[PDB]
Design an enzyme around this catalytic site. Structure first.
Site, PDB file in Angstrom:
ATOM      1  CG  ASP A 142      -2.239   0.684   0.889  1.00  0.00           C
ATOM      2  OD1 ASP A 142      -2.985   1.132   2.017  1.00  0.00           O
ATOM      3  OD2 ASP A 142      -2.579   0.931  -0.303  1.00  0.00           O
ATOM      4  CG  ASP A 153       0.863   2.953   3.659  1.00  0.00           C
ATOM      5  OD1 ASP A 153       1.833   2.483   3.106  1.00  0.00           O
ATOM      6  OD2 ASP A 153      -0.038   2.081   4.116  1.00  0.00           O
ATOM      7  CG  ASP A 198       2.648   0.673  17.134  1.00  0.00           C
ATOM      8  OD1 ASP A 198       2.707   1.757  17.687  1.00  0.00           O
ATOM      9  OD2 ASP A 198       1.699  -0.384  17.272  1.00  0.00           O
TER      10      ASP A 198
END
EC number: 2.7.7.19
Length: 390
Positions: free
Chosen positions: A52, A54, A110
């Site tokens: 993807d 992003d 994260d």
């Protein structure tokens, strides 16, 4: 090291970045500097293509609604605006008293190999964490304090397993210890938050290895209370082996751009669990089978559903998938044809394929071989099969 110059970092090549890159210039021109991260980056440094695209800019979700006031902007909720291209969409999150330095949005994310930044303006990446060595040596990294970072969002536990699984790369000694312990913590997370971070894991086409891991971190346990109860020590159950193949198949069915039914993996594991259920209730209370089953389904669902919110869509199907298991059973003079047409059929049989092989039951396998032939038959043969039974 908190940067790497154009050519020195595995030839990023402005080249394998998309139309997506297009957007990065109306920003690099109208004022703000835009940096792409994670999903493509992590992948792309190894060289492997991007899943993807992003994006992440400093321009607030407003200056942005104010900039691409034009483009078929869609997607409500804070920040997180989705600008559309067609078969290619581009997430747009802004950093995050709420907003600030990209470095600031670094600490809110994260994992190390999951968050490295770069602009077309610079052709240089930005390592605000050991990200590049973690990637070099195949190793999983929470960014900060394990103990904190999970109690804070225990969901972070799962992503962490999720990723060591997709890549033939290992977790970190420090990031790893906490979980067996905190594990359980998940319990207070709304079931459907769980239910989504679930699919993401194994019906990701990575499943088998993902669960090899999850089980081992007593992480499996919370989501499938219903289930774990039926494991055996030896390691050889049907329930046990069944899920081993149903995932193995899925790992494969996906690695081969083929639609997989979501409802299917679920009715897929629980068969036995519901089955051992259906059994006890059956006798332990005065009632006939067709009946007994009925609730068997409700409670495995209400129970597991309670463990993770399952869409009525999914359930309704999974229900059906079963109830047929009981119709493919009654060799019917002419009802066969009917079931044959049934919308949710292929799965029913798909299961039974599995089912008869783990159970290593002859009079099932006998049956599957039959539906096997009789389903690809023309009508002159089908006409005749149904006539050998009567």
């Amino acid at each position: 090291v908190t940067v790497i110059p154009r050519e020195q970092h595995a030839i990023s090549r402005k080249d394998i970045s998309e139309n997506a890159l297009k957007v990065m210039y109306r920003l690099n021109k109208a004022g703000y500097e835009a940096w792409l991260v994670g999903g493509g980056v992590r992948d792309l440094l190894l060289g492997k293509k991007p899943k993807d695209f992003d994006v992440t800019t400093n321009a607030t979700p407003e200056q942005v609604r104010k900039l691409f006031r034009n483009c078929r902007l869609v997607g409500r909720r804070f920040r997180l605006a989705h600008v559309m291209f067609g078969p290619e969409i581009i997430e747009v999150a802004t950093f995050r008293n709420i907003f600030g330095s990209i470095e600031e949005d670094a600490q809110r994310r994260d994992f190390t190999i999951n968050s490295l930044y770069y602009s077309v303006a610079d052709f240089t990446v930005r390592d605000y964490v050991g990200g590049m060595k973690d990637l070099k040596d195949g190793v999983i990294r929470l960014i900060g304090n394990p103990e904190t970072r999970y109690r804070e969002d225990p969901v972070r536990m799962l992503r962490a397993v999720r990723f060591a699984a997709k890549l033939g790369m290992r977790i970190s000694p420090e990031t790893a210890e906490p979980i067996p312990r905190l594990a359980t913590l998940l319990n207070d997370i709304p079931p459907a938050h769980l239910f989504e971070e679930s699919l993401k894991l194994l019906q990701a086409g990575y499943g088998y290895e993902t669960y090899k891991l999850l089980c081992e971190y007593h992480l499996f346990q919370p989501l499938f209370p219903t289930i774990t109860r039926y494991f055996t020590e030896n390691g050889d159950s049907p329930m046990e082996r069944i899920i081993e193949q149903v995932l193995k198949n899925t790992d494969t069915r996906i690695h081969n751009d083929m639609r997989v039914n979501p409802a299917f993996l679920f009715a897929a594991m629980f068969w036995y669990p519901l089955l051992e259920t259906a059994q006890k209730i059956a006798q332990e209370s005065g009632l006939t089978y067709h009946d007994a089953f009925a609730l068997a389904m409700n409670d495995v669902l209400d129970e597991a559903c309670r463990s993770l919110a399952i869409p009525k869509r999914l359930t309704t199907l999974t229900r059906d998938i079963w109830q047929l298991q009981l119709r493919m059973s009654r060799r019917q003079g002419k009802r066969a044809w009917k079931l044959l047409e049934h919308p949710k059929f292929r799965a029913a049989y798909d299961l039974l394929a599995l089912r008869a092989e783990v159970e290593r039951n002859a009079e099932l396998q006998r049956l599957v071989k039959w539906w096997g032939e009789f389903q690809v038959s023309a009508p002159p043969d089908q006409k005749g099969m149904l006539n050998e039974l009567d």
